[PDB]
Design a protein around this ligand. Sequence first.
Ligand code: HEM
Length: 165
Amino acid sequence: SLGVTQASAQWGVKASFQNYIRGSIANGSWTLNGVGFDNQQFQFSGNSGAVDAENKTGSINFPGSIHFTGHGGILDMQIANIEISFNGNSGELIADVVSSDMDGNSTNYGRTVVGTLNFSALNVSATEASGSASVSLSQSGSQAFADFYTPGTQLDPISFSATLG
Ligand code: HEM
């Protein structure tokens, strides 16, 4: 097995969700704690995780949170501590999620699979790993989005790169 030296990931959650949050219906915004933003993608930076190159499995862990708000605080969605887990060319996007429904009632979903990953590219070597995957929304993710997206909806794709040591 190989440890992650430096990893980075790029994921916008969903472009149409960003535009909704910042648009004239939600009249909302987001705040970031330990996460950046560029190219309409949240920017994650991590130095932990491990990759079993022999078996092409791994987990790439990131700190940081995104906090979406809208509708005078009725919409309140937190996504934190994302993790890209892979086994072969499939995997899971895991995060800690707390979100509210349209009544403003919050649910702590805990640490949950937000989507299943299907990698279009996944490369692993002695010194690096990188990949890009489509993200298919999970049951818990659909509930966290207040049922506005159905399970299986395609979110933004996620990409990552990591040095390994
Ligand atoms: C008073 C509360 C709310 C109202 C009136 C409301 C209303 C709406 C409306 C009218 C749309 C369509 C927007 C468009 O197509 O441009 C929409 C989309 C959406 N809403 Fe809200 N909503 C509320 C709360 C919430 C909450 C609590 C969530 C939880 C995350 C949420 C998640 C979404 C999502 C995911 C979409 C789809 C955005 C997209 O097009 O990608 N909404 N909502």
